[PDB]
Amino acid sequence: VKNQIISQPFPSLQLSISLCHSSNDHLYVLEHNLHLLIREFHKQTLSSIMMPHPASAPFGHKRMRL
Amino acid sequence: STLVDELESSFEACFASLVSQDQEEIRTGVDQCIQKFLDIARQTECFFLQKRLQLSVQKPEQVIKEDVSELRNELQRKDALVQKHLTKLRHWQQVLEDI
Amino acid sequence: NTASLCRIGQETVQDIVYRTMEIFQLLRNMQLGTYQDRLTKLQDNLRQLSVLFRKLRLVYDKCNENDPIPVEQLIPYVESEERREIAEVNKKLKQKNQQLKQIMDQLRNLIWDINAMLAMRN
Amino acid sequence: RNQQLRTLQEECDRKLITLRDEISIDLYELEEEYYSSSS
């Protein structure tokens, strides 16, 4: 809607994710995992897996080379 | 007579091949001794259960007394468990406070 | 009293058979200092078993002292302050069990949260 | 700065893992007691 996402994963269930901006029932686990998920999503770009140890080898992920 | 004494005699009969001064002799002797031993054990358990049944139909206050005792031991055991757990929780709060 | 003596007498017969089984296992493993340790274990087991036999004869005599109703008259076919004591202790450990359930649920939830949060850090 | 923060993170995670194991053993005892209660 504006700052609130509402989902219905199970039919009797309603999940709500809201960004509370103070501008001066809550589950902590999902908030903490949200921070870690976006942190892993950042670190995927800046990973050392993109580095090619063979100097001639161009670039990109390691298993995609394999 | 007196099933205790038959149990004692059969139990001593289980060892009779060892304590004195090949395979199939040992096998048949062991099977017969162990089967008579377990049979008299089951008859002794049957006697104790029949006597408990007659007591539970004639004198039912004793059963209620034993239930009272068992529920009281359950209470004391629950409190002992929660006290040990609470001491461990307070120790872990003192550990986690120091980071 | 006597209707717990019957329970103890059943438990003695249940212990005698288990103890003879443990004795036969000890005699199975004995390979001709640990020699002497197995000797001590064997002699101690045999001592406890003789104690169990004496206790069993005691319990037999006590229950056989203390029947006017024959069995098979006792089965139902188709066609007072101690009760209040029972109700008291029942209500007591009802409350104790519900509090124990709350403690157990909070421990479960803390364990699940710890494992989820630590699983996502990698 | 990176090495100091990594050491602090590792200390926190070791504390949490040991806490989880001790709490799990206590939970096992409490589960046995609660489920095997006569009531």
Swiss-Prot record, chain A:
Disulfide bonds: none annotated. It is found in: Nucleus. It comes from the Eukaryota. Ubiquitous. Coiled coil: none annotated. It is linked to Microcephaly, postnatal progressive, with seizures and brain atrophy: A disorder characterized by postnatal progressive microcephaly and severe developmental retardation associated with cerebral and cerebellar atrophy. Infants manifest swallowing difficulties leading to failure to thrive, jitteriness, poor visual fixation, truncal arching, seizures. There is no acquisition of developmental milestones and patients suffer from marked spasticity and profound retardation. Progressive microcephaly becomes evident few months after birth. Belongs to the Mediator complex subunit 17 family. Interacts with GATA1 and PPARG. Component of the Mediator complex, which is composed of MED1, MED4, MED6, MED7, MED8, MED9, MED10, MED11, MED12, MED13, MED13L, MED14, MED15, MED16, MED17, MED18, MED19, MED20, MED21, MED22, MED23, MED24, MED25, MED26, MED27, MED29, MED30, MED31, CCNC, CDK8 and CDC2L6/CDK11. The MED12, MED13, CCNC and CDK8 subunits form a distinct module termed the CDK8 module. Mediator containing the CDK8 module is less active than Mediator lacking this module in supporting transcriptional activation. This is Mediator of RNA polymerase II transcription subunit 17. It comes from Homo sapiens. The chain holds residues 327 to 407 of 651 of the full protein.
From Swiss-Prot, chain B:
Component of the Mediator complex, which is composed of MED1, MED4, MED6, MED7, MED8, MED9, MED10, MED11, MED12, MED13, MED13L, MED14, MED15, MED16, MED17, MED18, MED19, MED20, MED21, MED22, MED23, MED24, MED25, MED26, MED27, MED29, MED30, MED31, CCNC, CDK8 and CDC2L6/CDK11. The MED12, MED13, CCNC and CDK8 subunits form a distinct module termed the CDK8 module. Mediator containing the CDK8 module is less active than Mediator lacking this module in supporting transcriptional activation. Widely expressed. Highly expressed in vascular tissues such as placenta, testis and liver. Transmembrane segments: none annotated. Keywords: Actin-binding, Activator, Coiled coil, Cytoplasm, Membrane, Nucleus, Transcription, Transcription regulation. The keyword Metal-binding does not apply. Belongs to the Mediator complex subunit 28 family. It comes from Homo sapiens. Disulfide bonds: none annotated. Induction: Up-regulated by endothelial cells when exposed to tumor conditional media. The keyword Transmembrane does not apply. GO terms for molecular function: actin binding. Residues 62-98 form a coiled coil. The chain holds residues 42 to 146 of 178 of the full protein. This is Mediator of RNA polymerase II transcription subunit 28. GO terms for biological process: negative regulation of smooth muscle cell differentiation; positive regulation of transcription elongation by RNA polymerase II; positive regulation of transcription initiation by RNA polymerase II; RNA polymerase II preinitiation complex assembly; somatic stem cell population maintenance. One of its GO terms (cellular component) is core mediator complex.
UniProtKB/Swiss-Prot annotation, chain C:
Keywords: Acetylation, Activator, Coiled coil, Nucleus, Transcription, Transcription regulation. GO terms for molecular function: nuclear thyroid hormone receptor binding; nuclear vitamin D receptor binding; transcription coactivator activity; transcription coregulator activity; ubiquitin protein ligase activity. GO terms for cellular component: core mediator complex; mediator complex; nucleoplasm; nucleus; ubiquitin ligase complex. Residues 34-58, 80-117 form a coiled coil. Belongs to the Mediator complex subunit 30 family. Component of the Mediator complex, a coactivator involved in the regulated transcription of nearly all RNA polymerase II-dependent genes. Mediator functions as a bridge to convey information from gene-specific regulatory proteins to the basal RNA polymerase II transcription machinery. Mediator is recruited to promoters by direct interactions with regulatory proteins and serves as a scaffold for the assembly of a functional preinitiation complex with RNA polymerase II and the general transcription factors. This is Mediator of RNA polymerase II transcription subunit 30. It comes from Homo sapiens (Human).
Swiss-Prot record, chain D:
It is found in: Nucleus. Component of the Mediator complex, which is composed of MED1, MED4, MED6, MED7, MED8, MED9, MED10, MED11, MED12, MED13, MED13L, MED14, MED15, MED16, MED17, MED18, MED19, MED20, MED21, MED22, MED23, MED24, MED25, MED26, MED27, MED29, MED30, MED31, CCNC, CDK8 and CDC2L6/CDK11. The MED12, MED13, CCNC and CDK8 subunits form a distinct module termed the CDK8 module. Mediator containing the CDK8 module is less active than Mediator lacking this module in supporting transcriptional activation. The chain holds residues 101 to 139 of 200 of the full protein. Residues 1-22 form a coiled coil. Signal peptide: none annotated. Component of the Mediator complex, a coactivator involved in the regulated transcription of nearly all RNA polymerase II-dependent genes. Mediator functions as a bridge to convey information from gene-specific regulatory proteins to the basal RNA polymerase II transcription machinery. Mediator is recruited to promoters by direct interactions with regulatory proteins and serves as a scaffold for the assembly of a functional preinitiation complex with RNA polymerase II and the general transcription factors. Belongs to the Mediator complex subunit 22 family. The lineage of its organism: Eukaryota, Metazoa, Chordata, Craniata, Vertebrata. The gene is MED22. This is Mediator of RNA polymerase II transcription subunit 22.
